[PDB]
Amino acid sequence: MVHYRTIDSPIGPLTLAGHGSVLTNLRMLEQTYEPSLTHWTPDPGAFSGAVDQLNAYFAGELTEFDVELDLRGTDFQQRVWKALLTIPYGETRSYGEIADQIGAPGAARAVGLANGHNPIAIIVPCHRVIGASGKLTGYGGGINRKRALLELEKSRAPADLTLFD
């Protein structure tokens, strides 16, 4: 089937799901409607690699993820989530820039709606994309989760303090 595990984090109870050792889902589900949750087996020891990476990520030790994903969505969504995965830690892009990257100049608004449907939060970094106005998006408190995540990434102390020696 598809099995799931829930872990805690600074921005809330993250839920990881997928078949075997492959993520298909990662969303802070607390206090929203997730239909497909009833069709899922609980397994408190799955995706063991991932949680480490996450807990490391939240601690600031991790900059890049090594996890296997299976994004399912329309072709357009596929391409937008492809581009998303090419924005590095500590950086951002505008919705327009993404629209150019995927080869459909002018589709700022479509990316934004395709960002909303991102199956895997944090690892596919939907938070590293912002409009020109700087106003962030998201219902459910999702704005604060994005903001928090952006702050955490910017507050990254320079890695080696030996470059100052």
Curated annotation (Swiss-Prot):
Compartment(s) where it occurs, according to its Swiss-Prot or TrEMBL record: Cytoplasm
Protein keywords: Cytoplasm, DNA damage, DNA repair, Methyltransferase, Transferase
Pfam family, one: DNA_binding_1
Matching SUPFAM superfamilies: Methylated DNA-protein cysteine methyltransferase domain (SSF53155), Methylated DNA-protein cysteine methyltransferase, C-terminal domain (SSF46767)
TM ranges: none
Recorded GO MF terms: methylated-DNA-[protein]-cysteine S-methyltransferase activity
Any one GO CC term of the record: plasma membrane
Enzyme class: transferase
EC number of the protein: 2.1.1.63
Main location: cytoplasm
Signal peptide from the UniProt entry: none
Function (record text): Involved in the cellular defense against the biological effects of O6-methylguanine (O6-MeG) and O4-methylthymine (O4-MeT) in DNA. Repairs the methylated nucleobase in DNA by stoichiometrically transferring the methyl group to a cysteine residue in the enzyme. This is a suicide reaction: the enzyme is irreversibly inactivated.
Classification via HAMAP family: OGT
Similarity-based family: Belongs to the MGMT family.
Extra remark: This enzyme catalyzes only one turnover and therefore is not strictly catalytic. According to one definition, an enzyme is a biocatalyst that acts repeatedly and over many reaction cycles.
Protein name: Methylated-DNA--protein-cysteine methyltransferase
Natural source organism: Mycobacterium tuberculosis (strain ATCC 25618 / H37Rv)
Gene transcribed to yield this protein: ogt
